[PDB]
Design an enzyme around this catalytic site. Structure first.
Site, PDB file in Angstrom:
ATOM      1  N   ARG A  41      24.071  25.857 -20.577  1.00 25.01           N
ATOM      2  CA  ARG A  41      25.039  24.852 -20.184  1.00 25.01           C
ATOM      3  C   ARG A  41      25.562  25.101 -18.775  1.00 25.01           C
ATOM      4  O   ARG A  41      25.892  24.154 -18.049  1.00 25.01           O
ATOM      5  CB  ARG A  41      26.185  24.791 -21.203  1.00 25.01           C
ATOM      6  CG  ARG A  41      25.873  23.937 -22.395  1.00 25.01           C
ATOM      7  CD  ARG A  41      26.478  24.489 -23.662  1.00 25.01           C
ATOM      8  NE  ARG A  41      26.203  23.625 -24.810  1.00 25.01           N
ATOM      9  CZ  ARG A  41      27.118  22.893 -25.436  1.00 25.01           C
ATOM     10  NH1 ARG A  41      28.389  22.924 -25.039  1.00 25.01           N
ATOM     11  NH2 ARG A  41      26.756  22.091 -26.430  1.00 25.01           N
ATOM     12  N   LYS A 217      22.369  13.654 -46.639  1.00 23.87           N
ATOM     13  CA  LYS A 217      23.234  12.515 -46.891  1.00 23.87           C
ATOM     14  C   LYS A 217      22.745  11.152 -46.412  1.00 23.87           C
ATOM     15  O   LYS A 217      22.116  11.038 -45.392  1.00 23.87           O
ATOM     16  CB  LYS A 217      24.636  12.780 -46.303  1.00 23.87           C
ATOM     17  CG  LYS A 217      25.537  13.593 -47.215  1.00 23.87           C
ATOM     18  CD  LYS A 217      26.276  14.664 -46.415  1.00 23.87           C
ATOM     19  CE  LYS A 217      27.212  14.047 -45.389  1.00 23.87           C
ATOM     20  NZ  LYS A 217      27.887  15.053 -44.527  1.00 23.87           N
ATOM     21  N   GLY A 375      20.305  17.539 -32.604  1.00 19.91           N
ATOM     22  CA  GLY A 375      21.041  18.783 -32.541  1.00 19.91           C
ATOM     23  C   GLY A 375      20.436  19.607 -33.686  1.00 19.91           C
ATOM     24  O   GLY A 375      19.704  20.569 -33.448  1.00 19.91           O
ATOM     25  N   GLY A 398      28.590  14.326 -30.591  1.00 13.92           N
ATOM     26  CA  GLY A 398      28.861  13.131 -31.352  1.00 13.92           C
ATOM     27  C   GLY A 398      28.489  11.960 -30.482  1.00 13.92           C
ATOM     28  O   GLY A 398      28.006  10.945 -30.976  1.00 13.92           O
TER      29      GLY A 398
HETATM   30  N1  LIG Z   1      15.327  17.476 -48.947  1.00 11.53           N
HETATM   31  C1  LIG Z   1      16.430  18.178 -48.509  1.00 11.53           C
HETATM   32  N2  LIG Z   1      17.338  18.859 -49.331  1.00 11.53           N
HETATM   33  C2  LIG Z   1      18.415  19.545 -48.851  1.00 11.53           C
HETATM   34  N3  LIG Z   1      18.759  19.667 -47.534  1.00 11.53           N
HETATM   35  C3  LIG Z   1      17.877  19.004 -46.718  1.00 11.53           C
HETATM   36  C4  LIG Z   1      16.711  18.238 -47.097  1.00 11.53           C
HETATM   37  N4  LIG Z   1      16.026  17.679 -46.007  1.00 11.53           N
HETATM   38  C5  LIG Z   1      16.815  18.135 -44.990  1.00 11.53           C
HETATM   39  N5  LIG Z   1      17.937  18.933 -45.335  1.00 11.53           N
HETATM   40  C6  LIG Z   1      18.966  19.573 -44.397  1.00 11.53           C
HETATM   41  O1  LIG Z   1      20.290  19.486 -45.011  1.00 11.53           O
HETATM   42  C7  LIG Z   1      21.349  19.041 -44.042  1.00 11.53           C
HETATM   43  C8  LIG Z   1      21.990  17.723 -44.603  1.00 11.53           C
HETATM   44  O2  LIG Z   1      22.997  17.304 -43.635  1.00 11.53           O
HETATM   45  P1  LIG Z   1      23.022  15.742 -43.121  1.00 11.53           P
HETATM   46  O3  LIG Z   1      21.709  15.482 -42.484  1.00 11.53           O
HETATM   47  O4  LIG Z   1      24.139  15.717 -42.182  1.00 11.53           O
HETATM   48  O5  LIG Z   1      23.274  14.848 -44.331  1.00 11.53           O
HETATM   49  C9  LIG Z   1      20.614  18.788 -42.529  1.00 11.53           C
HETATM   50  O6  LIG Z   1      21.038  19.978 -41.650  1.00 11.53           O
HETATM   51  C10 LIG Z   1      19.035  18.788 -42.958  1.00 11.53           C
HETATM   52  O7  LIG Z   1      18.179  19.482 -42.058  1.00 11.53           O
END
Ligand SMILES: Nc1ncnc2c1ncn2[C@@H]1O[C@H](COP(=O)(O)O)[C@@H](O)[C@H]1O
Length: 417
Positions: A41, A217, A375, A398
């Site tokens: 950075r 999610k 990220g 963000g």
């Molecule tokens: N099939 C999966 N099951 C559980 N976690 C996962 C899966 N695929 C990806 N992830 C990781 O779990 C985290 C979920 O956070 P988000 O993407 O913010 O909903 C991210 O850092 C993804 O890299």
């Protein structure tokens, strides 16, 4: 519309000689015991600092933030150690002031070698920067409108020109993002780059535009997903998310896989808008499943039709779907990737996310413009060490998100053209 890009940058800023330029940079760096342990950075802003330096500039006042002191001076978040780093990168003395605004600041600045670089302390030590903050006993506290106004003009008194090289923090409207009311406001080389690739991809991209989304999610992506459906041509939904879609849409036996209760309710709306907007949705049709969430656990492959047995969960795309990637990606002209396709942090379940990267990197060389901004996604590009194989990996926090969510970004709107 089309606000992004078409702004003003260092590049092509005449009359900088003998002027005082104020630069807002991103110095929020990881540090251990006054030992900065990642100077990217800092090195990144060198181009900007260098350019200004060989152009005249009586002074180069740098302002930035680190961490979240929340309006109270916290020694764990001082920029001092960064000033030391710059001395060795610039090869000259650097001035560190433990203040951002004030009479002494202005005086000490004027009394400093004619082509000197000066670096003030963390702006976030002043509640008036973010607007709110907390106190000793940790209680929410809000700034005083008079104070914020005083702080913004005190900053505007620091220099003549203002260059903002802090994307990734332009989605917030903080004092240093929309307060420096100077006449000349331009982007730093870093900023300028970001604003360049995003508009080149959100305003008028070479089709087909591909959006690769991923992550457990689906509930915290409704806004992102929708705002894109009405501007993209193809879209791959993967990683955890898929499961929720596959159950709502195909009645697939998800097994133990992750299921988003909240999101399961917006699946209808999406699929609908997607069809209406004529966007192709691509979802995995087979997946590697484990009998327990952990690297090195019995694992097998199944199809969406076969379904995942009980007490078994899916953790990555099966090979049929990973082969199904080539076509969708290699045929795209522009690509916005945000989301790993599986639990990449676990070797055994990172093949789908690794193979996508290669395909993204490879389509780049084929001439397509590829942008990453995740990220968590970048962390994969970083671990793989392929930042350069990609057109642009947005160092935007963000900020990147809201722009892909359709939001406005005060930090940018406050820039000249
Ligand atoms: N099939 C999966 N099951 C559980 N976690 C996962 C899966 N695929 C990806 N992830 C990781 O779990 C985290 C979920 O956070 P988000 O993407 O913010 O909903 C991210 O850092 C993804 O890299």
């Amino acid at each position: 519309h089309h606000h992004l890009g078409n702004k003003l940058s260092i590049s092509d800023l005449k009359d900088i000689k003998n002027k005082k330029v104020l630069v807002r940079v991103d110095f929020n760096v990881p540090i251990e015991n006054g030992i900065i342990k990642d100077t990217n950075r800092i090195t990144a802003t060198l181009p900007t600092i260098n350019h200004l330096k060989k152009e005249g500039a009586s002074k180069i006042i740098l302002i930035s933030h680190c961490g979240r002191p929340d309006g109270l001076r916290n020694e764990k978040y001082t920029l001092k150690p960064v000033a030391e780093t710059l001395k060795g990168l610039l090869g000259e003395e650097v001035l560190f002031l433990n203040d951002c605004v004030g009479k002494e600041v202005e005086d000490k600045i004027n009394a400093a070698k004619e082509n000197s670089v000066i670096l003030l302390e963390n702006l976030r030590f002043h509640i008036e920067e973010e607007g709110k903050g907390v106190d000793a006993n940790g209680n929410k506290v809000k700034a005083n409108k008079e104070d914020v106004e005083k702080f913004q003009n005190d900053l505007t008194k620091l220099a003549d020109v203002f260059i903002n090289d802090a994307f990734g923090t332009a989605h917030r409207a903080h004092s240093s993002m929309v307060g420096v009311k100077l006449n000349v406001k331009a982007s730093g080389f870093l900023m300028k780059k970001e604003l360049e690739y995003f508009s080149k991809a959100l305003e008028n991209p070479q089709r087909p535009l591909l959006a690769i989304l991923g992550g457990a999610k689906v509930s915290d992506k409704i806004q992102l997903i929708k705002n894109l459906l009405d501007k993209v041509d193809r879209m791959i939904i993967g990683g955890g998310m898929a499961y929720t879609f596959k159950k709502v849409l195909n009645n697939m036996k998800i097994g133990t896989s992750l299921f988003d209760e909240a999101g399961s309710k917006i699946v209808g709306e999406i699929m609908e808008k997607a069809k209406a907007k004529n966007v192709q949705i691509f979802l995995p049709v087979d997946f590697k499943i484990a009998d327990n969430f952990d690297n090195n656990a019995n694992t097998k492959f199944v199809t969406d039709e076969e379904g995942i047995p009980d007490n078994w969960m899916g953790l990555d795309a099966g090979p049929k779907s990973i082969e199904n990637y080539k076509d969708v990606i290699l045929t795209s002209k522009t690509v916005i990737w945000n989301g790993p396709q599986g639990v990449f942090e676990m070797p055994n379940f990172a093949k789908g996310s690794i193979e996508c990267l290669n395909l993204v990197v490879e389509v780049t060389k084929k001439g397509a413009i590829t942008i990453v901004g995740g990220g968590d996604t970048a962390s994969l590009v970083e671990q793989q060490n392929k930042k350069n194989e990609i057109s642009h990996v947005s160092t935007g926090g963000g900020a990147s998100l809201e722009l892909l969510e359709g939001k406005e970004l005060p930090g940018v709107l406050a820039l000249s053209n």
